Design a protein around this ligand. Structure first.
Ligand SMILES: C[C@H]1CCCC(=O)CCC/C=C/c2cc(O)cc(O)c2C(=O)O1
Ligand SMILES: C[C@H]1CCCC(=O)CCC/C=C/c2cc(O)cc(O)c2C(=O)O1
Lengths: 238, 10, 233, 10
């Protein structure tokens, strides 16, 4: 395993190099919004992001060493979390707006056009505002995203101790980044705690979002791809 | 089996 | 400008330890039905909640918040608080959940109630995780206080986050006391706080289950429990 | 206007 043989800098550059591209939406400024249309846009984007995410996870150090079965499980639990922290990250410098795509920038008012959406919009906007005041760096973001992929499903399965080992390495990397930025030890630990506590909120937003996705599936007016349905079924809501 | 399974294989 | 920030790490620890709620008992019993087990658990939850409120008021910095901010934090976190408490006292009972000293249940009994076994397994997994980490009581009370102040902080600021830093310092101070190196200190801190993500997840699953119990309308739910539940939608 | 208010104030 080369994942535990990587330095902090080698960890950072690897994660940075593995970054998925910013995809565009099929958004038509001519077309008036409807519920079905806006949701259709968002579910379509998510489906396309998923393909890039799955191939991104392969390039996360340590993920390849897991069994296929364990890879499937981690991605099934964490996929909406990964999307969400990605959405929040690229929305950082657009206060009061979520940048789903470069051509798809939405405020909370447009989230109200979809019943039950607004609550999730506000939580995402608050997360994005929190990253802004912390001045979250790209190097820290990619660490947090990899932590989510490895940590979220680890309590729901010999192989775990390897996962926790990789997780410990990423923690080392975060601290290395903070010490590099001139922070004191007290500040390093405080910032580390601040960043990891965000993940609690990201889990919460995902759980809520998953429930919303389940409801969309039931009223059956918004087209959901087969992959998106399978990720949804993986959480087994009733 | 499922799609995620296949995409993780290729 | 208040008193929580002035405390030392040891004064923080002793305050939290002193504020700990008591271990409550369940009713003395006959094999459990779905309604009987849920009755005992909801009854227990209601009595634990009353002690949780007084416990919360004794967490340094919580009294400085407005009445409405205190309400928001508790409404958001109450099930999380119950769960880490349940998980904590279940540590020395592998494969079992110690709801009360006279209510020690395993996963087979979680199957007395539909949809309960998954929550049971998640709690059990969390408990053994704490066990394998050798979680200390001083670390536990820090984690529980953290859950209280953090879970609802993104659904409202500065005071709360300063108290959170204060507890992080206290957590690190505890690990430095135990003889852990700097690397082990921030590694363990990370390991502990990542558990809170799972605890959040368990609480969200548990909240949905409580909602469906309300809809079934067979298990008697107190008005307090009903209000705490309705705050999440 | 809730039970939680009473418990916190007492
Ligand atoms: C607003 C939130 C509700 C999440 C609940 C939901 O409706 C998911 C289906 C629509 C997808 C939205 C979406 C798509 C992406 O490519 C990235 C994302 O972060 C999201 C997303 O976070 O949706
Ligand atoms: C099993 C789980 C399902 C959570 C869902 C649920 O049924 C909540 C209502 C019954 C109360 C359970 C309970 C009571 C306590 O005093 C402490 C607890 O940790 C719980 C609890 O964790 O409930």
């Amino acid at each position: 395993s080369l994942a535990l043989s990587l330095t902090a800098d080698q960890m950072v550059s690897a994660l940075l190099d593995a970054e998925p591209p910013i995809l565009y939406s099929e958004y038509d400024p001519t077309r008036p919004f409807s519920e079905a249309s806006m949701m259709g846009l968002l579910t379509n984007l998510a489906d396309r992001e998923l393909v890039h995410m799955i191939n991104w996870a392969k390039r996360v150090p340590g993920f390849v060493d897991l069994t296929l079965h364990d890879q499937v499980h981690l991605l099934e639990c964490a996929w909406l979390e990964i999307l969400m922290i990605g959405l929040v990250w690229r929305s950082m410098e657009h206060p009061g707006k979520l940048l789903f795509a470069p051509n798809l920038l939405l405020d909370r008012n447009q989230g109200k056009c979809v019943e039950g959406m607004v609550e999730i919009f506000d939580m995402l906007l608050a997360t994005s505002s929190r990253f802004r005041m912390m001045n979250l760096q790209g190097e820290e973001f990619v660490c947090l995203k990899s932590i989510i992929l490895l940590n979220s499903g680890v309590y729901t399965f010999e192989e775990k101790d390897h996962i926790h080992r990789v997780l410990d390495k990423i923690t080392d990397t975060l601290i290395h980044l903070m010490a590099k930025a001139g922070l004191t030890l007290q500040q390093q630990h405080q910032r580390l705690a601040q960043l990891l506590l965000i993940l609690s909120h990201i889990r919460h937003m995902s759980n809520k979002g998953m429930e919303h996705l389940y409801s969309m599936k039931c009223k059956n007016v918004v087209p959901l791809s087969d992959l998106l349905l399978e990720m949804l079924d993986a959480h087994r809501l009733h | 089996h499922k799609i995620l399974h296949r995409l993780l294989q290729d």
